[PDB]
Amino acid sequence: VLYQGVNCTEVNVFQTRAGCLIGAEHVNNSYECDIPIGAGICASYQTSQSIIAYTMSLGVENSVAYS
Amino acid sequence: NNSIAIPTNFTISVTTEILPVSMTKTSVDCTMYICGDSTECSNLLLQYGSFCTQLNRALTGIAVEQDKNTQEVFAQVKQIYKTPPIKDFGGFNFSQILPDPSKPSKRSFIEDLLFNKVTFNGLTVLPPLLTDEMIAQYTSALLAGTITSGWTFGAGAALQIPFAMQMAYRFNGIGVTQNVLYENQKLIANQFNSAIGKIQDSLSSTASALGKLQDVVNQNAQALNTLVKQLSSNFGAISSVLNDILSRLDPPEAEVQIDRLITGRLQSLQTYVTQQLIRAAEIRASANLAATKMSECVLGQSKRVDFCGKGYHLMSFPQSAPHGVVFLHVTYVPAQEKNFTTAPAICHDGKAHFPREGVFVSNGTHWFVTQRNFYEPQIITTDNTFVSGNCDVVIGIVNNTVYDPLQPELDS
Amino acid sequence: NGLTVLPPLLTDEMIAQYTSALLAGTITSGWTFGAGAALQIPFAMQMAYRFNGIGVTQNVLYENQKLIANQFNSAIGKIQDSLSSTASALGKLQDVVNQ
């Protein structure tokens, strides 16, 4: 559950920029937008299973081999 | 009927085009707006039915569409491309528009100018799905693809190509023979670098240049301020305040006064939601246009005259801006013409010759063929031209003698 | 009844000046006035460039120029007769007044 625009003081528990997010687990590693949340956070059911929440990855990074 | 003006020189130009892409995502608790959570009004509002729920459904449609717009505009790229350590793009600058490492959010210098110059009674504002930092990575990715790999990252994987050759391509795309770039590379790099420099001064000079983005920010503040001010309205009721009515008039009479406040506040909220549905359609028309210019002007080169800055289009660079996008369209403009005598075809020995590409001209004393968009005379020859029938049918043909470059070798 | 109609900022004479300018540029200078100054070019050569833009070689114009001129002049004649003969063509504008 996301409480949109709340600080957790007022309500696992995680503070996002979108709000105090409850029942999801914070993960530092970044992945595709599976479920959108807001302010770059997304959530998914990746595996032994729970809902995770993480900062989304915009795509694979690639330094083009220009000279 | 025998005069043509051909440009002997040109200017690279950089035209800044600014487009709205998204509104401030908004959702309103219609019960907290109308009733202030005071139960005697909520027990009346329940009797109006779907006018509670469907306004949140309508504003949720608007709120999701702001993320869909911003996704379609910026997330056209398949990978996050990033620029090499070396910056030797043939002399062409690429610094004020690439990321600045000192900027916390890795925006470019021109993105920072744009981010400076643009500027809860049951109402709620929702964050965008992509933060300003994430949008600034997509505008860096589209830019680093565009610098290192031309249009190829719009067709498949980015294929590297040296930047002077990518411009030689893009000249060859506007009917200028690519030698015109290489023979002028330092001048073209200086015209481009100077033209970028004028953008920083132009954007510094007045906030009135960003009017399209300052408008989408102003109109949403103006709509919500009016929606809040409409709480202070009677609509025929004894007072504009609900708990005041519930203290004074006894429940029977109170109900008729409150039902006016419900009707008035609800009609004001339907008016606001209807206006936002129409404003969101106008912003979506702008977001589809911006999503098109990413595809055609950034990821490509466009033949569409005056779709992509004035002059013939070479390339463009996107830069992010609050609630929108800015394109720096780079265009070739022909700039110093001379008048020349011309004829549609020439006669050799009993044969009409037409130019293969380019057009015939004379300085008044000699006849030449030149490419159409830059004066560069070449002696008229059997490879530069093709024959098509005798020396009669054409109107305004001239007499001449075409050189045939094989004949000196057939002297062997 | 408190309703009013405001004048347009450009009068129909000023629109006729702009359509005259667009048209006289298009006749004397091709596409070039959409980039630089209006570079003059002879109109038979401007059509040869526009034929070259559809994959038809320039000689197909000049070898048929007097024929092509008669086809164009006749076609404008049919437009002028068609618009003179019936009001039914202007539905897309008349509908905007009617609504």
Next chain:
Amino acid sequence: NNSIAIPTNFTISVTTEILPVSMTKTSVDCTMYICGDSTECSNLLLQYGSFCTQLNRALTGIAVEQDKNTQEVFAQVKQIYKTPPIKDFGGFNFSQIL
């Protein structure tokens, strides 16, 4: 798998296309449409708050945009180019449209 048709002749064609560009610029005084002359009724309308201004503002936004549409369509040209006095246009006759 071995047949092609090629044109041996052409027609130049002229096709009319028609697009609307502006509504008739229209504006309403909401107090004069709703009330009209009555100071009594005009004072009663103040109880409805911002709608009188908001509706006249929306019609002003539409009315101003009609001038913008007309300039966005026709005012694309920097200079008023003048047609030359002598019509050496290789036989092509533009009298009807000049």
Next chain:
Amino acid sequence: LQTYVTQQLIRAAEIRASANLAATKMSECVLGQSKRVDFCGKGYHLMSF
């Protein structure tokens, strides 16, 4: 009056779509030569007045 102004906002948005289409045809079909099939009436496009 609210019904009239709401319908005129929607009609004016349709006329804006037509005015942007006309400005696009002015830009491409007059000031240039379209290579976009059947954007400029049937046939291969030459010019428009």
Next chain:
Amino acid sequence: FVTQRNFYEPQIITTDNTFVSGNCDVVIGIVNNTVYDPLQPELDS
């Protein structure tokens, strides 16, 4: 070699695959290299 730009297909560099424009002095990053002449087999007929 010279190729078409969207599919690797090497052509031997020749005076009909290519066009002249002035000296080397101004062209940044030019290299040397033979350009073959398709007339040469009958120049030496």
